Amino acid sequence: KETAAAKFERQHMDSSTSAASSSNYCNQMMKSRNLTKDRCKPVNTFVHESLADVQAVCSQKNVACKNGQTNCYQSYSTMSITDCRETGSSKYPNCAYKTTQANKHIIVACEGNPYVPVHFDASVSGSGKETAAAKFERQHMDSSTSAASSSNYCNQMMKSRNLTKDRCKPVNTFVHESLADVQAVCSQKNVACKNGQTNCYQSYSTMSITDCRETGSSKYPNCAYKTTQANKHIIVACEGNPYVPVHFDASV
């Protein structure tokens, strides 16, 4: 009795190779992964990243699924993938595939506790205007973990969230709570923002957060950060309809 999570790993995870080696990669992989047992599965994608990196996508950019469901997520970073497309001459049981290597953003459907990938929805190339709300989630939300597990957390997250692309963002906080919990802050204690505007809100409760601050010797493009885990109230600026966070003002 294969779990949906396990099925996704069998069909879409290749955490053993950084990329497709041979034009026969798909020919071998589709067979070994049982995607040609009772029929030649026409098309399939394998992801060449750690299971951790792929599972992490479930806490990244929320997008509508092709089927209309709302539990799809697009990766902030492009990933190494291999598309497998059955050839025209392919004929079961000797299923034959065209192997195609690329680096694209992936979109996966997520379910469960833990919240993990259960379907592969699409791949995307990607300018791309970001809503203020989406930017807040990219810069300040890390629902994938309850706290920083090591001192390298910020080094990795500041990079993976694209906060070091052109320069090292000196200071940044990630919040380890549900998006619903953070969005609820916009209906809590109204306070002034640092800038004197009054669309800021302090969370009634303390929250698990990770403070990232560039070290004194950090120099682009070699961004280095000190990681500090804490439990503090957060203060966010909220805007729009739905009324959601668009800036991280402070923690207290």
Curated annotation (Swiss-Prot):
Subcellular location, principal: secreted
Any GO BP: defense response to Gram-positive bacterium
EC class name: lyase
GO cellular component, one term: extracellular region
Compartments where located: Secreted
Coiled-coil residues: none
Protein known as: Ribonuclease pancreatic
Keywords carried by this UniProt record: Disulfide bond, Endonuclease, Glycation, Glycoprotein, Hydrolase, Lyase, Nuclease, Secreted, Signal
Reactions catalysed, as given in the entry: an [RNA] containing cytidine + H2O = an [RNA]-3'-cytidine-3'-phosphate + a 5'-hydroxy-ribonucleotide-3'-[RNA]; an [RNA] containing uridine + H2O = an [RNA]-3'-uridine-3'-phosphate + a 5'-hydroxy-ribonucleotide-3'-[RNA]
GO molecular-function term, one example from the UniProt record: lyase activity
Protein task: Endonuclease that catalyzes the cleavage of RNA on the 3' side of pyrimidine nucleotides. Acts on single-stranded and double-stranded RNA.
Residues annotated as catalytic: H12, H119, H140, H247
Residues where substrate binds: 7, 10, 41-45, 66, 85, 135, 138, 169-173, 194, 213
Positions glycosylated per UniProt: K1, K7, N34, K37, K41, K129, K135, N162, K165, K169
Quaternary assembly: Interacts with and forms tight 1:1 complexes with RNH1. Dimerization of two such complexes may occur. Interaction with RNH1 inhibits this protein. Monomer.
Tissues/organs with expression: Pancreas.
Stated family: Belongs to the pancreatic ribonuclease family.
Organism: Bos taurus (Bovine)
E.C. number(s) listed in UniProt: 4.6.1.18
Section covered of the full-length record: 27 to 150 of 150
Keyword Disulfide bond applies: yes
Gene giving rise to this polypeptide: RNASE1
